[PDB]
Design a protein around this ligand. Structure first.
Ligand SMILES: O=C(c1ccc(O)cc1)N1CCOCC1
Ligand SMILES: [Mg+2]
Length: 209
């Protein structure tokens, strides 16, 4: 049971702009994804302060970065609050329509693609490096879903029967052939140190055999 959905026109436009604009500073995608993860983790931590049972789906609050050169994927896993199916369909928890309007106006006026996170649509910077993005997520109030999109104006949602996550969000970046630098340990470490120094959760970079 796979459901296919059209992006809102303004979100298809943002994705196209991201894909088609010449812009060399692509490494900011990782900062934006880690930032989203940090915000998701903040959310569950806040809930947990008045209801400890909120962490029954897992107490550890962290971010893992998992490169796989065989599959040409980079995976960003967090144990944050996760997303319900509704929030996944509603632009992965963002106010993407108004965010994209503001970002576009900022760009027309001299901002650049690196400032995307100030407009609350940083998720979509994944498409600077990924030909396809898969998002697996689990929220305490819903089941585990997989969202997926190779852009082109549509995404799919299905119940995920894969490995259960407990709680949180996993973003799997199926990288463009020319973007495999972001599987290399030294490159990922450099990006993290440069851009994510003040993220208040452990970020563990996995190594490959
Ligand atoms: O799970 C996520 C999430 C995590 C990481 C991403 O890259 C995108 C969404 N979110 C739900 C809580 O509100 C923030 C978004
Ligand atoms: Mg913020």
């Amino acid at each position: 049971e796979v459901e296919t959905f059209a992006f809102q026109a303004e979100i298809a436009q943002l994705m196209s702009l991201i894909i088609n604009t010449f812009y060399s500073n692509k490494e900011i995608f990782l900062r934006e994804l880690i930032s989203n993860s940090s915000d998701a983790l903040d959310k569950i931590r806040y809930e947990s302060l008045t209801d400890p049972s909120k962490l029954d789906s897992g107490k550890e609050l962290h971010i893992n970065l998992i490169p796989n050169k065989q599959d040409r994927t980079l995976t960003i896993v967090d144990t944050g609050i996760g997303m319900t199916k509704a929030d996944l369909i509603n632009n992965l928890g963002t106010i993407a329509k108004s965010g994209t309007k503001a970002f576009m106006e900022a760009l027309q006026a001299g901002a650049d693609i690196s400032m995307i996170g100030q407009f609350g649509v940083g998720f979509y910077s994944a498409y600077l490096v990924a030909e396809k993005v898969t998002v697996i997520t689990k929220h305490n109030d819903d089941e585990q879903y997989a969202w997926e999109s190779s852009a082109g104006g549509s995404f799919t949602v299905r119940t995920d029967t894969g490995e259960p996550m407990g709680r949180g969000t996993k973003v799997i970046l199926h990288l463009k052939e020319d973007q495999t630098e972001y599987l290399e340990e030294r490159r990922i470490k450099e990006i993290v140190k440069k851009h994510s120094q003040f993220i208040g959760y452990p970020i563990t970079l996995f190594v490959e055999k």
